[PDB]
Design a protein around this ligand. Sequence first.
Ligand SMILES: [Cl-]
Ligand SMILES: [Cl-]
Ligand SMILES: [Cl-]
Ligand SMILES: [Cl-]
Ligand SMILES: [Zn+2]
Ligand SMILES: [Zn+2]
Ligand SMILES: [Zn+2]
Ligand SMILES: [Zn+2]
Ligand SMILES: [Zn+2]
Ligand SMILES: [Zn+2]
Ligand SMILES: [Zn+2]
Ligand SMILES: [Zn+2]
Ligand SMILES: [Zn+2]
Ligand SMILES: [Zn+2]
Ligand SMILES: [Zn+2]
Ligand SMILES: [Zn+2]
Ligand SMILES: [Zn+2]
Ligand SMILES: [Zn+2]
Ligand SMILES: [Zn+2]
Ligand SMILES: [Zn+2]
Ligand SMILES: [Zn+2]
Ligand SMILES: [Zn+2]
Ligand SMILES: [Zn+2]
Ligand SMILES: [Zn+2]
Ligand SMILES: [Zn+2]
Ligand SMILES: [Zn+2]
Ligand SMILES: [Zn+2]
Ligand SMILES: [Zn+2]
Ligand SMILES: [Zn+2]
Ligand SMILES: [Zn+2]
Ligand SMILES: [Zn+2]
Ligand SMILES: [Zn+2]
Ligand SMILES: [Zn+2]
Ligand SMILES: [Zn+2]
Ligand SMILES: [Zn+2]
Ligand SMILES: [Zn+2]
Ligand SMILES: [Zn+2]
Ligand SMILES: [Zn+2]
Ligand SMILES: [Zn+2]
Ligand SMILES: [Zn+2]
Ligand SMILES: [Zn+2]
Ligand SMILES: [Zn+2]
Ligand SMILES: [Zn+2]
Ligand SMILES: [Zn+2]
Ligand SMILES: [Zn+2]
Ligand SMILES: [Zn+2]
Ligand SMILES: [Zn+2]
Ligand SMILES: [Zn+2]
Ligand SMILES: [Zn+2]
Lengths: 169, 169, 169, 169
Amino acid sequence: QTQPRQNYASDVEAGINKQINLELYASYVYQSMAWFFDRDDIALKGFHKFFKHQSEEEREHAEKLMQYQNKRGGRIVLQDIQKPERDEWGTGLEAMQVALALEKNVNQSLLDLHKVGAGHDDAHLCDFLEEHYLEEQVKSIKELSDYVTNLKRVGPGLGEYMFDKESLS
Amino acid sequence: QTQPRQNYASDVEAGINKQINLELYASYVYQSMAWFFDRDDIALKGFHKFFKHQSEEEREHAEKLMQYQNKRGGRIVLQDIQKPERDEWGTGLEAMQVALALEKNVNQSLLDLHKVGAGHDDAHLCDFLEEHYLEEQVKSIKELSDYVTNLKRVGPGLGEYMFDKESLS
Amino acid sequence: QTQPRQNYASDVEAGINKQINLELYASYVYQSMAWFFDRDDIALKGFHKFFKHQSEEEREHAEKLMQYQNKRGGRIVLQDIQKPERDEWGTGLEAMQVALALEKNVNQSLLDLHKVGAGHDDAHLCDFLEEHYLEEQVKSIKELSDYVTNLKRVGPGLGEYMFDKESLS
Amino acid sequence: QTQPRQNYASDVEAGINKQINLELYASYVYQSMAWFFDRDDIALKGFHKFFKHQSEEEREHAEKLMQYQNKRGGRIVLQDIQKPERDEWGTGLEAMQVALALEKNVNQSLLDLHKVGAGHDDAHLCDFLEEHYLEEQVKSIKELSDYVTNLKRVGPGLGEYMFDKESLS
Ligand SMILES: [Cl-]
Ligand SMILES: [Cl-]
Ligand SMILES: [Cl-]
Ligand SMILES: [Cl-]
Ligand SMILES: [Zn+2]
Ligand SMILES: [Zn+2]
Ligand SMILES: [Zn+2]
Ligand SMILES: [Zn+2]
Ligand SMILES: [Zn+2]
Ligand SMILES: [Zn+2]
Ligand SMILES: [Zn+2]
Ligand SMILES: [Zn+2]
Ligand SMILES: [Zn+2]
Ligand SMILES: [Zn+2]
Ligand SMILES: [Zn+2]
Ligand SMILES: [Zn+2]
Ligand SMILES: [Zn+2]
Ligand SMILES: [Zn+2]
Ligand SMILES: [Zn+2]
Ligand SMILES: [Zn+2]
Ligand SMILES: [Zn+2]
Ligand SMILES: [Zn+2]
Ligand SMILES: [Zn+2]
Ligand SMILES: [Zn+2]
Ligand SMILES: [Zn+2]
Ligand SMILES: [Zn+2]
Ligand SMILES: [Zn+2]
Ligand SMILES: [Zn+2]
Ligand SMILES: [Zn+2]
Ligand SMILES: [Zn+2]
Ligand SMILES: [Zn+2]
Ligand SMILES: [Zn+2]
Ligand SMILES: [Zn+2]
Ligand SMILES: [Zn+2]
Ligand SMILES: [Zn+2]
Ligand SMILES: [Zn+2]
Ligand SMILES: [Zn+2]
Ligand SMILES: [Zn+2]
Ligand SMILES: [Zn+2]
Ligand SMILES: [Zn+2]
Ligand SMILES: [Zn+2]
Ligand SMILES: [Zn+2]
Ligand SMILES: [Zn+2]
Ligand SMILES: [Zn+2]
Ligand SMILES: [Zn+2]
Ligand SMILES: [Zn+2]
Ligand SMILES: [Zn+2]
Ligand SMILES: [Zn+2]
Ligand SMILES: [Zn+2]
């Protein structure tokens, strides 16, 4: 076994590699959304900047899992990053709804990983997810939920424009 | 009688205890409203912050009456703080209308207390209410009246959103 | 279900509402104690300030649970805040003994909630209690235990006076 | 009548002159107490400084009434300042008890004056007493009550010494 390895189950190591790919995928989805909102026929800079930031964060989430894998003595095994489901993401409301669904899918993956680790008494994995992932996910889901509500409140047209200016700067 | 007591009628002492409970109740109503506007399906941060501030102020009003009771040699007798009438508070307009009605009820209580004290020539009580309560109430009622008018002016939807951004930050 | 809700059991949501009321109750007990020590015939300013601070903290604990409920997509349901058991709290020693017993009761409630969440694999709830509540409770219980010991050490009269000056400023 | 005089009853003018003498008397009592605590066989510097400050305040109270009399167009008529009842004032506790009784006597005089003015609709007198005298009296009475309680708590000897050091610096 590798020099560091201790109390690190093979299925947790595999779950870390799975989560790495999922975070990279989420980064790619948000990158697609960011540049969609930079199109001349969409042209919402606040949405552009919001999803650019979300993409950067997801890449950070992936890198922190790469670091984690090596710290525990696991081995990083990368997979293809699939292209997103769509090339175009609709209105600001529709993109926020996609983001919310994506974040709940990532959250379920993280909770599943936590449960695998708990079955193996992997308290270090537990701590890592609690300190860096689970509350970050809940905060992201609540933020996006709030945005969906307000994009419904303001409506299309001038409403979407003002939300981009006032809620997303 | 207690060491400080002088020119302090029993019914004024009782009225101070009644007002303490009413201020604590008002604090609790505003706390309920504040966190209602933090719900993911309501999501108006300016309303949230406004009612959070109003709740904190009411708690201050109650504590200042607790201090007053002891300064005069009365004795604080606390009662239960009843839960608010509702769990959910409707639109921004509807919540402001509830707040306005609440503040006029608190004002009537304070004016009633002033009248009790005046009948007993309790100039210190008079001063305390004039310096700390009566103009504060009138200012609160005028502010909320102005907000009700403007929430009617702007209308639902984008209007409520913009009022939250521009009048309540 | 609400937009955010994920891995959030109904009995955890209910337990959060129960804890909200308990924290508000504790706040009210400490507020009663604070103003008791401001009475002219008690007149211990350090005890007054200590319990004032404890009351403010408990209100913070309650608000953080209100925020938590909304972040998870639960719904806040407020109950009456019962008046404390007593109007008068005895010596400094006796009040500290009441506070210690109260904090151990709040701690047991929090540990019970942790156990409910653990049965539902609610790692986010676990994290929230570990980060914000459980060590805060242990620290509070140890502090109050230390104060009880020292109030017994110094004795009544000048001892209580000096403890108020030197341990509570 | 004098150039300023308006809505100023003769019995209010006389009551102002009476209050002037009472404030000067209180100043003299506190001056006697201050220098008693500077005696080599008493030697409590905190009590000395406390009563020195109280004497200075009372002189300020008298001067503000002298100014008031002239502002309303009344005429100041000074009377003898009687020597205090005692040359020696006993323990710290006993002096604080004398001070408390004195302040309640001054308060009753002020409340009597307020009542005279109210019968004459003298709102300016009312305001003057509310702004400068009545709450100042209540605060003084509460402070002295608190000190009496604590001087009983600490007891004679080392207790009195420590109260002088810790409560009166
Ligand atoms: Cl675990
Ligand atoms: Cl009046
Ligand atoms: Cl757990
Ligand atoms: Cl009047
Ligand atoms: Zn396994
Ligand atoms: Zn850009
Ligand atoms: Zn962010
Ligand atoms: Zn993050
Ligand atoms: Zn992520
Ligand atoms: Zn492919
Ligand atoms: Zn994410
Ligand atoms: Zn753990
Ligand atoms: Zn865990
Ligand atoms: Zn870390
Ligand atoms: Zn703008
Ligand atoms: Zn009456
Ligand atoms: Zn807030
Ligand atoms: Zn305000
Ligand atoms: Zn106020
Ligand atoms: Zn109020
Ligand atoms: Zn009830
Ligand atoms: Zn109010
Ligand atoms: Zn008045
Ligand atoms: Zn009045
Ligand atoms: Zn005041
Ligand atoms: Zn704007
Ligand atoms: Zn359960
Ligand atoms: Zn205080
Ligand atoms: Zn503390
Ligand atoms: Zn705390
Ligand atoms: Zn607490
Ligand atoms: Zn009850
Ligand atoms: Zn506590
Ligand atoms: Zn945990
Ligand atoms: Zn746990
Ligand atoms: Zn943890
Ligand atoms: Zn936190
Ligand atoms: Zn000391
Ligand atoms: Zn008259
Ligand atoms: Zn001196
Ligand atoms: Zn002073
Ligand atoms: Zn003064
Ligand atoms: Zn005076
Ligand atoms: Zn004489
Ligand atoms: Zn005085
Ligand atoms: Zn007046
Ligand atoms: Zn008056
Ligand atoms: Zn003035
Ligand atoms: Zn010392």
